[PDB]
Amino acid sequence: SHMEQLKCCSGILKEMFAKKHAAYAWPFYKPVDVEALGLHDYCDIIKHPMDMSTIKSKLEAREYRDAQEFGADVRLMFSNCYKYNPPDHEVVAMARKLQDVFEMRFAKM
Numbered sequence: 625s626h627m628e629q630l631k632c633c634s635g636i637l638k639e640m641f642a643k644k645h646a647a648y649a650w651p652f653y654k655p656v657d658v659e660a661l662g663l664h665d666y667c668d669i670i671k672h673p674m675d676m677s678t679i680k681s682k683l684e685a686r687e688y689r690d691a692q693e694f695g696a697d698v699r700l701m702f703s704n705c706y707k708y709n710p711p712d713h714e715v716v717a718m719a720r721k722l723q724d725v726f727e728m729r730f731a732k733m
């Protein structure tokens with residue numbers, strides 16, 4: 625059922641927030657601070673920004689019908705990081721390490 629799938633999605637999100645993954649997951653915890661980090665081009669390149677806090681808020685507000693809608697938002701967060709930043713960047717390697725954690729848990733449900 626859809627109600628059961630969303631419960632598993634909360635579990636994946638919680639593990640993504642845990643201390644174990646904090647070293648590489650932290651730049652995704654909250655929305656990207658464009659003005660403070662000096663990224664003016666970010667709003668022009670990234671049309672739909674996404675982060676773990678926004679996903680956690682959308683989950684609590686029941687904005688996802690099923691696991692696929694939740695999964696679409698998690699993958700959008702990673703896709704935005706891959707698009708804006710060059711492949712050699714540290715935040716891309718961090719995104720890949722976090723996506724490996726997500727894809728492993730999301731597949732096993």
Ligand SMILES: CCS(=O)(=O)c1ccc2c(c1)-c1cn(C)c(=O)c3[nH]cc(c13)CN2CC1CC1
Nearest residue numbers: 650651654655656657661704705708709714715
């Ligand atoms: C509360 C988070 S923050 O203060 O907005 C924050 C703080 C830092 C931070 C980001 C966000 C960030 C996130 N993403 C999704 C990017 O695409 C991106 N591109 C370059 C950077 C970012 C700079 N870095 C990562 C840092 C070098 C290891």
